[PDB]
Design a protein around this ligand. Sequence first.
Ligand code: NI
Length: 341
Amino acid sequence: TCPFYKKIPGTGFTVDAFQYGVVEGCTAYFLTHFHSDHYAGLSKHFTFPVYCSEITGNLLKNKLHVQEQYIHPLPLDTECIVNGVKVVLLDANHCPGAVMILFYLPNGTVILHTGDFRADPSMERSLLADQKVHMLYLDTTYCSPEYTFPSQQEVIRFAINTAFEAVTLNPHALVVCGTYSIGKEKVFLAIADVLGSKVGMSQEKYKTLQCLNIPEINSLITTDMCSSLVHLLPMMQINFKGLQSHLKKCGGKYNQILAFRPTGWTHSNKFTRIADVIPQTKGNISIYGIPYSEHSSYLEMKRFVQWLKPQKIIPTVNVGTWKSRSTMEKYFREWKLEAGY
Ligand code: NI
């Protein structure tokens, strides 16, 4: 049945709740972003109103064939009325089209639902600064102090410098990048930009990217693999056997692969600086795991919550075990005592 942390009190609304069938009493289904653990259940046969960003609505129509008459895209940073209730969509700094949702309840309660987000100080200057938030539905993916990672900018600098040096040393090396969903586009686009290449990919993945309003995308991506020296493959194929096989398909154009796997976190982070990252190598194939995150680190999350000062926090991630839930509640109390709210 639908969990309570997916339901907005005082309304008929749910958030990211498409896999429960007809949720009783639900008049509007919101979708924060196009990731499968959130959209699971949507299809051309869905006949209730879906509220989302423009980019998410393009993906619903083109990838899932949801019918246009049930897609209700909203502009960002704009007060809108849904079934009698004021709402605002804010940029979540997650994947393309991902939003946080502000709900202004008729009784005066204000609720923020972060969806999935990577907290940033730029959020402290959005419409959130203009009123108090009483209840926070919080993406707690990395809510423990061991989760540190570098800025996205530092990670992309490392990837660009590594790829440029490799291909300049060996003009017959191929660069491969893994993907399994939208997000993390800067990884492969930045590497293709420094090399003077388009990114080559499957027709299905090209279609997905063309839904994203990214400026000058026709100039950076292609379905012609022969003309590209940066290739995008499914994340599952980013291993030595999968890469050896890909190299066979390129017909002797290339004699070396440099591959990137942009994981979230991996325990090399508690010790290793970004400068100190090394690949796994076998023969003429090297694989780099780089810590490119589209979720808050522990400290980013803590800063956001201590700025916002909510009266009540409702975690939405890691809620399935008692030790995880109790641990998170202990951090929330610490943050509140330190900051004085
Ligand atoms: Ni997500």
